[PDB]
Amino acid sequence: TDIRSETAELRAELVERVHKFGPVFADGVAEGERERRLPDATVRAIDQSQLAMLWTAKSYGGLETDVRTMSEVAKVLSHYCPSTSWVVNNVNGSNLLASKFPRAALDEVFGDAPGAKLASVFAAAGTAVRTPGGYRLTGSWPYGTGILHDDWAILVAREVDADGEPVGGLSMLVPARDLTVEDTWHTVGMRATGSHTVVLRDTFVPEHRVISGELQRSRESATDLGLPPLFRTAAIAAMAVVCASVVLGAGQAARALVVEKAPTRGIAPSKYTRQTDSRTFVSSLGRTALSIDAAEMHVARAATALDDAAYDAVALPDSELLRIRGDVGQAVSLVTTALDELLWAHGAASFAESNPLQRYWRDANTAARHAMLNVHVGHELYGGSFFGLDPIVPSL
Amino acid sequence: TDIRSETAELRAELVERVHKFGPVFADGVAEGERERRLPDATVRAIDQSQLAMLWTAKSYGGLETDVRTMSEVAKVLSHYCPSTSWVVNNVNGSNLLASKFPRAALDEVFGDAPGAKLASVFAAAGTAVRTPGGYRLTGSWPYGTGILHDDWAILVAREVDADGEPVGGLSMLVPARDLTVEDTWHTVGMRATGSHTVVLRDTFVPEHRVISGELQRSRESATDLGLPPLFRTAAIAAMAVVCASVVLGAGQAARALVVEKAPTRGIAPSKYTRQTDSRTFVSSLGRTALSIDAAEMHVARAATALDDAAYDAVALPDSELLRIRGDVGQAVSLVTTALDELLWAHGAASFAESNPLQRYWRDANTAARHAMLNVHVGHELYGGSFFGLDPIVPSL
Amino acid sequence: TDIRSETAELRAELVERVHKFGPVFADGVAEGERERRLPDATVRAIDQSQLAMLWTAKSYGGLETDVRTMSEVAKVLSHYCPSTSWVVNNVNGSNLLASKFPRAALDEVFGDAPGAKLASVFAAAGTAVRTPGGYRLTGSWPYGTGILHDDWAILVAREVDADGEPVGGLSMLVPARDLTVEDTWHTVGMRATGSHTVVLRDTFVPEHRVISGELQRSRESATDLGLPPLFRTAAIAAMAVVCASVVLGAGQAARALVVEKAPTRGIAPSKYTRQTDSRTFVSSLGRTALSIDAAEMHVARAATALDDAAYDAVALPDSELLRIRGDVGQAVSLVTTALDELLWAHGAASFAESNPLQRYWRDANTAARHAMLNVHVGHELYGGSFFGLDPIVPSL
Amino acid sequence: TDIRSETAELRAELVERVHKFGPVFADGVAEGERERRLPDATVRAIDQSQLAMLWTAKSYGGLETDVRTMSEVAKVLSHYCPSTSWVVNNVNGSNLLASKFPRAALDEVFGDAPGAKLASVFAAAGTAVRTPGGYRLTGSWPYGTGILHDDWAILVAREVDADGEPVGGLSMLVPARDLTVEDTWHTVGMRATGSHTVVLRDTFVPEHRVISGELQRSRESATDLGLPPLFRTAAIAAMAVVCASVVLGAGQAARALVVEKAPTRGIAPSKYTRQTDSRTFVSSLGRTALSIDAAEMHVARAATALDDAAYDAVALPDSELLRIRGDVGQAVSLVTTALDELLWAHGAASFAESNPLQRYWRDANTAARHAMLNVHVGHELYGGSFFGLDPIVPSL
Ligand SMILES: Cc1cc2nc3c(=O)[nH]c(=O)nc-3n(C[C@H](O)[C@H](O)[C@H](O)COP(=O)(O)OP(=O)(O)OC[C@H]3O[C@@H](n4cnc5c(N)ncnc54)[C@H](O)[C@@H]3O)c2cc1C
Ligand SMILES: Cc1cc2nc3c(=O)[nH]c(=O)nc-3n(C[C@H](O)[C@H](O)[C@H](O)COP(=O)(O)OP(=O)(O)OC[C@H]3O[C@@H](n4cnc5c(N)ncnc54)[C@H](O)[C@@H]3O)c2cc1C
Ligand SMILES: Cc1cc2nc3c(=O)[nH]c(=O)nc-3n(C[C@H](O)[C@H](O)[C@H](O)COP(=O)(O)OP(=O)(O)OC[C@H]3O[C@@H](n4cnc5c(N)ncnc54)[C@H](O)[C@@H]3O)c2cc1C
Ligand SMILES: Cc1cc2nc3c(=O)[nH]c(=O)nc-3n(C[C@H](O)[C@H](O)[C@H](O)COP(=O)(O)OP(=O)(O)OC[C@H]3O[C@@H](n4cnc5c(N)ncnc54)[C@H](O)[C@@H]3O)c2cc1C
């Protein structure tokens, strides 16, 4: 348990860093909401805290943690700024996805930049064609979380021939200098995430920064004893677990806020001048809190399954991954229902622009509908695993 | 059934008016959201359509309808602009509340103004003291829906003596010329309702425009055959039923929108490229639709109970009113849960500023937490009626 | 509204009959539970009350009511004996189904027997082959509600040729003298319904007592002005609405019982020595009661849609029938969830054999899973109607 | 982690014992249901397996495990016989409660009987009066789980003086030879548990077998390094956690059964001839499974909190105990809702006496309403902890 102790010690330290830098992130909430991008101070704090480096390899100066640590960090980050938490989660996840690329690419990205920050969008395909020494890539990729502050982007594309017929799927790593960002992110939640559209036209991408779509989604590294444990982790599932953690954390912040304010407000137009005087209020809050507790456990269970497998160098069977997909959708669904309950508890005041409760409500609800967190898809995937049905998603 | 036919004919005509003027209200949504008040064109349309006049007496040129008609109008209005619907509902309800005042006041308000529009705020008390010929009134009343466009306001206050000791409760009718409006309405939903703060300082209010709080909440007119049936209606309960209708209508619009868009969108990242191809999606939508249908029936049942009693000139017993309070909270609770479900159905796109789905979601959620719609209070009131417990609210 | 008044008067009279004969049905609950059939006194009371005759034609001495009346009768019956209610509902529904047969069959059944009682099972197919003057029928039909007391049975079969190849579907009317009943009904709920297996071997059925399966499910009589309104009703949907009413009524009886007992019991091991002293208990009960109220409205809405169409001699479109299927599944689902809630309210004592609460719980739960009440199928059917998908059931 | 490994090894061995003896328990289900007591073979198997000895001290030849082990054993036991599981859980819990008594009593109970089996009923008070050398005890105690097979019983009583005035609360240990059992357990679930009434009349109980009620509920041993860790455990909370495990396990067995049968049955009257062909069915089952998974985690979390505190010799603060009370009520509530869902999945066949599904449904539902598992009380307790309100139960 020497390593177990070490990993726990680091997690605590990282959680304490979140608390230390949290007032900066909180301070920039108003500007972020207004401008739909993270303020400069927040980006600075992310680079100084090293919170973008949790899933970066030690060989490049990264912290190289595990899923559970990243999850606990994301939950605490959300208390201060759910958008920052979301971006930080996306960066670490993108960096982890980068590890499927060759060493040549990884050196080019992380070699002189321990704090390198990647975007990744699987939400579109662009079209790529072979050229000498690489590919020529054209496309338009929406939902590019944190792309304004990112150094590189992993983009999905379809390879085509001279005729324009489909050849196969690709994953491509392209630098900020080669990208253009189009202002398309106009939403009512997660505004500062800056999930704008990445645009490429006839852009050259060399061969060493391109892998097959099959390789990008591969879980063959699960049993590779040569790799450190983090790079054995099922990456896509891990990313989904930390996205759920962002949502979860916002829900938990919402709960803490309602608890904080309940002794000094009433329930109009009742005789209950203090919320805590109403037993209906108190018992309801207990129930809502237990749903959020359940969501937390679903997330932690999935994180632990992923880490245990990576540490033991075993492959997670499909049934276990299908269950993880169910856990994450179920956790965020539980959180959105609980937020609705917390607004009923708090009252009309919760919708004031000055009240953080509506911020958590809007950010968690927006983020929860991310595709990898879809509750109905998760339900169908987990249910299907009981009978060995063909999954309804292309990769796990 | 001659009258039954007549009342149905009028309702249909009014619903058709909503459709006719609806494109104007819809057109001003963006400005209303931006400015936190209804645009001039919307106010003009409200005055031309006579939709503020449903609960104004025929003797003054009003349409003098019933609860069910007002409810059906409110539901349809919400499709075009939930804020307009909310304001229109508040105006009619305020006008109905005005009927507790003496004829002298009613003549002063409606005598040369068939389209007079009242606000009413029970959300604060101001302090009033006797002066010769009336009272001197000071206070600050938040949540003044539609006050910027209103001609008069009904405000609650506490009478006090020279010593400053409490004497009793009052309801006071004061004109726009005597009011000041303070800009305090900064919310994330129902923005165009302009529910700002009304401020009064040492304002004179004459005796004929002041009644006891007891008289304002009175239901003694329930059995008065001299009055037309609308003025026999339990007014506070009626107002709550139409507030619920505003929320309900937004929910129904949300449902229609999700149905409209489902055949041309998919469920990422599944194999379902069309939402309608997924049986999980289809059956879930059926379930969500049945909750909204239940909310509609709760609202309609309460409206019908209120109208039947007014037409028959019978008093509703307390148990029936307590049940109505439960129905309205339960209906809006059902609607907010269903909206959460509709976002899961529609996906991440629902949170774009260009998508009406998030508008219905923000407006219905904000309005649902109005005090007269509190779901937990309603549950407690209805439950209590089964055992004859003392109600937890001061008036029914 | 002369007829409207008449129909309401009859319904009240029938409801009063249920109260009059209810103590007999209640008295035989223990024997019925023990023997898995209705006691002789109960059968006698059913014949004397004429409650099996609501959907029998006036021309044969039947009461010829409508769906709403049958529904309200079923709900009240369930308070005394849910099994009796279930049987009575099945008999009326079977009698209504009989009206698709030729006049020759109807005369043979009802001509000298105004109180004739039919079974009907669509739960199996038997196999029938042409013979001169009719058919020879062999099969085994489970779930034959009330078959032990029934005079005739409507059984579904597949016609086959000499080769044994399928020809088509049939509905066959066969008398008690020709049937054999096999003891197969061993259940933990609805025990006295006696839903045993009907067995036939090479039984002759004449031509006039056989119709096509297509004719049995037909709704062509919806527009026939020659028929009285009851025989224009969509029969299968009507039967499903009254089956739901049986379940609903049991739920309502359960609610009344929990209300009755709450002031004299406590909530162990809390300080609440009286259930009514606990506000959590009271507010929860209010919520449960509103779900049951919603189930009641779903049932009533469907009944009214069916009656309005029959009275106006219009065909219900498919979308309206699909909605009715959704309403009935949703109502019974709401009732089973509410029963679970009522057990939480009442406590461990609810599971004693002496407590009627567990009887309502077991009977409503068993009956709710009847195929025509399946909640998931109803959800899929209603959801599908929004997009005009092919229904997942063969007939509506 | 040497001990951690050891404790895990023992748990696995015990779980394997449950599987070995499980066919005996399963075999006696029909007799147990019929006779309302455990069959002789089942009692024999309980004694041979040593499953009553998990919470008996090592010093007396007991297995002396922890909460988590007992919980995992209870869950697996329920698959074979929920009544046996319930009895076994009650025995271990009673044996753990016995450890508050003096060494003299413990020696008298366990000294020559490593497999001693205790009952315990807190559901009544009897009345006890001082006599020389002890007390004279009279009372009637219902809900005496497993009393027919038990060697001793812990019974709660109120001490009174000669006048008959109340003096204080007592806990009394009395042997089978001194007890009389009255046949009062007539229920529709958990029938074989034989939770009959214990009757005592003027029975002598010596001083060394009597402690104060305060001492019986005490948690002062939480920090006593002299005691083994099991006897430092918060006993009443531990007992509630394993009662919940019995219910949980029945739910899990129900889930496994529905999964097992789904490929060979259909959903009447739909086109889905195989349940697994229906995506609505599959996704619903996934959701139901995730609720049961959440219930499992709630139970495991509480077990772990209790064990970690016992091993570290720290006292659990009140807030942690209040949370455990919430977890257990919430888990069983989740299980009863999920069982309702599983019946909808399986269909009408689930209510046949031959189907194990209705057995799990009846046993889990009956046991869930035990006072220490009340969901509404748990919600109120956990909610209250957030604000430090006075708990609504007398002990934690
Ligand atoms: C706040 C927020 C931030 C987001 N950030 C990102 C991001 O940084 N990167 C990102 O890729 N996505 C991001 N997403 C989006 C997610 O991938 C989906 O695109 C989004 O939920 C819209 O789904 P849809 O059904 O509207 O998708 P669509 O419009 O259907 O997407 C189009 C196609 O992309 C495929 N697709 C979409 N998303 C994914 C995915 N995650 N993995 C694989 N295939 C996919 C689908 O199969 C579909 O064919 C974000 C969503 C939100 C709400
Ligand atoms: C969009 C929106 C529009 C609203 N418009 C109006 C409006 O036009 N007029 C209006 O009066 N209220 C309005 N309300 C408010 C409602 O009455 C409550 O004031 C509000 O829900 C907040 O309650 P609270 O618990 O924060 O209590 P507080 O606002 O803090 O209430 C203070 C006191 O006012 C009393 N009180 C508050 N509301 C009422 C009421 N409706 N009836 C009787 N007593 C009351 C309470 O019992 C308490 O004593 C609106 C709310 C929303 C969200
Ligand atoms: C208390 C109770 C009483 C019942 N009484 C009756 C009764 O009097 N008559 C009766 O027919 N059924 C009755 N049913 C049963 C119902 O029709 C279904 O048979 C039952 O729900 C079992 O469904 P399953 O999926 O196990 O049926 P299955 O065993 O799958 O049924 C066999 C076949 O018949 C078809 N089928 C079954 N029921 C129906 C129906 N109602 N309409 C059309 N097709 C059907 C199915 O599609 C299937 O192909 C009763 C059920 C219960 C619980
Ligand atoms: C299957 C089953 C098995 C049970 N087995 C047992 C058992 O072995 N031992 C046992 O004590 N109870 C047992 N119970 C019962 C439980 O303790 C409660 O008595 C029961 O839940 C009924 O509660 P009630 O509200 O009807 O209150 P009543 O039982 O009518 O309450 C009587 C008094 O006893 C007190 N009381 C009851 N139970 C408890 C408790 N568990 N702890 C502290 N105080 C209590 C209550 O405060 C109340 O003052 C069992 C219940 C079930 C359903």
Short mmCIF file of C-alpha atoms and ligand atoms in Angstrom, two decimals, chain A residues 265-273 275 345-351, chain B residues 86 90 94 119-125 141-147 150 154 156 158 185 187 189-191 193-196 217 236 239 243 325 363 365-374 394-395, ligand 2:
data_model
loop_
_atom_site.label_atom_id
_atom_site.label_comp_id
_atom_site.label_asym_id
_atom_site.label_seq_id
_atom_site.Cartn_x
_atom_site.Cartn_y
_atom_site.Cartn_z
CA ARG A 265 -34.84 32.35 4.54
CA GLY A 266 -38.44 31.24 4.66
CA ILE A 267 -40.90 29.40 2.45
CA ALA A 268 -43.45 31.83 1.11
CA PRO A 269 -46.30 32.16 1.75
CA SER A 270 -46.28 29.64 4.56
CA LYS A 271 -45.93 30.14 8.28
CA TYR A 272 -42.37 28.74 7.96
CA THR A 273 -40.26 31.91 8.28
CA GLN A 275 -36.72 26.85 5.92
CA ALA A 345 -36.14 24.14 -1.93
CA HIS A 346 -34.49 27.53 -2.35
CA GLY A 347 -37.34 29.38 -4.07
CA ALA A 348 -37.70 32.12 -6.65
CA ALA A 349 -34.56 33.89 -5.48
CA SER A 350 -32.51 31.13 -6.99
CA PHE A 351 -33.08 32.60 -10.48
CA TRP B 86 -47.18 35.83 -17.37
CA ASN B 90 -51.00 38.92 -13.61
CA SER B 94 -54.97 41.92 -10.35
CA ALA B 119 -50.27 45.21 -10.78
CA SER B 120 -50.51 43.60 -7.41
CA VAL B 121 -47.80 42.69 -4.94
CA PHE B 122 -48.39 40.78 -1.71
CA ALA B 123 -44.60 40.13 -1.46
CA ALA B 124 -43.95 43.00 0.96
CA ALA B 125 -45.63 45.09 3.40
CA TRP B 141 -42.44 46.14 -2.85
CA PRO B 142 -40.30 43.74 -4.98
CA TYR B 143 -41.63 41.38 -7.69
CA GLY B 144 -43.99 43.92 -9.28
CA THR B 145 -44.89 42.05 -12.44
CA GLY B 146 -45.64 44.31 -15.37
CA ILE B 147 -45.50 47.48 -13.24
CA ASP B 150 -49.55 49.27 -15.41
CA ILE B 154 -52.60 46.88 -5.41
CA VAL B 156 -50.20 45.16 0.82
CA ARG B 158 -49.42 47.10 7.67
CA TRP B 185 -35.36 42.66 -11.81
CA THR B 187 -33.01 37.20 -13.54
CA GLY B 189 -35.85 33.65 -16.70
CA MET B 190 -39.07 35.58 -17.19
CA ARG B 191 -36.90 38.62 -17.92
CA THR B 193 -42.00 40.43 -17.15
CA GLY B 194 -40.27 43.46 -15.60
CA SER B 195 -41.00 42.42 -12.04
CA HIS B 196 -39.26 45.47 -10.58
CA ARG B 217 -58.78 37.85 0.89
CA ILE B 236 -56.59 34.01 -5.04
CA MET B 239 -54.96 33.56 -9.89
CA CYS B 243 -50.15 31.25 -13.12
CA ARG B 325 -53.44 24.46 -4.07
CA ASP B 363 -39.17 30.83 -18.11
CA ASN B 365 -38.66 27.08 -14.18
CA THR B 366 -38.47 30.67 -12.91
CA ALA B 367 -42.23 31.17 -12.81
CA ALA B 368 -42.91 27.79 -11.23
CA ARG B 369 -41.21 28.88 -7.97
CA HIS B 370 -43.70 31.62 -7.39
CA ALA B 371 -44.98 31.29 -3.83
CA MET B 372 -48.56 30.45 -4.75
CA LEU B 373 -47.26 27.55 -6.79
CA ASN B 374 -44.90 25.97 -4.19
CA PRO B 394 -52.72 32.28 6.22
CA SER B 395 -55.39 32.46 3.49
C1 LIG E 2 -41.42 35.67 -12.08
C2 LIG E 2 -42.03 35.99 -10.76
C3 LIG E 2 -42.98 36.95 -10.68
C4 LIG E 2 -43.56 37.28 -9.49
N1 LIG E 2 -44.49 38.21 -9.49
C5 LIG E 2 -45.10 38.53 -8.38
C6 LIG E 2 -46.12 39.57 -8.33
O1 LIG E 2 -46.47 40.17 -9.31
N2 LIG E 2 -46.67 39.85 -7.19
C7 LIG E 2 -46.34 39.22 -6.10
O2 LIG E 2 -46.92 39.54 -5.10
N3 LIG E 2 -45.42 38.28 -6.05
C8 LIG E 2 -44.77 37.90 -7.11
N4 LIG E 2 -43.84 36.89 -7.06
C9 LIG E 2 -43.40 36.31 -5.82
C10 LIG E 2 -44.00 35.38 -4.81
O3 LIG E 2 -45.09 35.99 -4.19
C11 LIG E 2 -42.93 35.24 -3.75
O4 LIG E 2 -42.63 36.52 -3.25
C12 LIG E 2 -41.63 34.70 -4.28
O5 LIG E 2 -41.93 33.47 -4.85
C13 LIG E 2 -40.47 34.57 -3.32
O6 LIG E 2 -40.79 34.01 -2.06
P1 LIG E 2 -39.75 33.92 -0.91
O7 LIG E 2 -39.96 32.62 -0.30
O8 LIG E 2 -38.46 34.29 -1.44
O9 LIG E 2 -40.35 34.97 0.12
P2 LIG E 2 -40.15 36.53 0.28
O10 LIG E 2 -40.16 37.21 -1.01
O11 LIG E 2 -38.98 36.79 1.07
O12 LIG E 2 -41.48 36.96 0.95
C14 LIG E 2 -41.52 37.89 1.99
C15 LIG E 2 -42.89 37.84 2.62
O13 LIG E 2 -43.90 37.97 1.65
C16 LIG E 2 -44.92 37.01 1.84
N5 LIG E 2 -45.43 36.68 0.50
C17 LIG E 2 -44.64 36.53 -0.55
N6 LIG E 2 -45.35 36.25 -1.62
C18 LIG E 2 -46.62 36.22 -1.27
C19 LIG E 2 -47.88 35.98 -1.95
N7 LIG E 2 -47.87 35.70 -3.25
N8 LIG E 2 -48.99 36.03 -1.22
C20 LIG E 2 -48.98 36.31 0.09
N9 LIG E 2 -47.87 36.53 0.75
C21 LIG E 2 -46.68 36.50 0.15
C22 LIG E 2 -44.21 35.85 2.49
O14 LIG E 2 -45.10 35.07 3.26
C23 LIG E 2 -43.20 36.55 3.33
O15 LIG E 2 -43.88 37.03 4.46
C24 LIG E 2 -43.19 36.56 -8.25
C25 LIG E 2 -42.23 35.58 -8.32
C26 LIG E 2 -41.65 35.27 -9.52
C27 LIG E 2 -40.60 34.24 -9.59
#
